[PDB]
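Changelog entry: the Transient receptor potential cation channel subfamily V member 1 record was regenerated in this release. Current contents:
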Amino acid sequence: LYDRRSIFDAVAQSNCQELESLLPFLQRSKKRLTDSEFKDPETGKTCLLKAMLNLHNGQNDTIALLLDVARKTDSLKQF
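Regenerated structure tokens:
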């Protein structure tokens, strides 16, 4: 299982492992990386955007994984 907080922390430290079980989670719950619940309720920030702020050496592959997940559910464009 994953809440907003869980992923945002993973992203903060460029961890591509804690997101191993990610894709299969919102396959079961059919939740979308774009759901109301996966954004900050007052800014509209998403994990991809958290990743965009949490750069280390202009790099983050949580991005590459995060995008990849969004196409597999094709949240892709709006994500």
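The CA atoms of residues 36 and 44 lie 9 Å apart.
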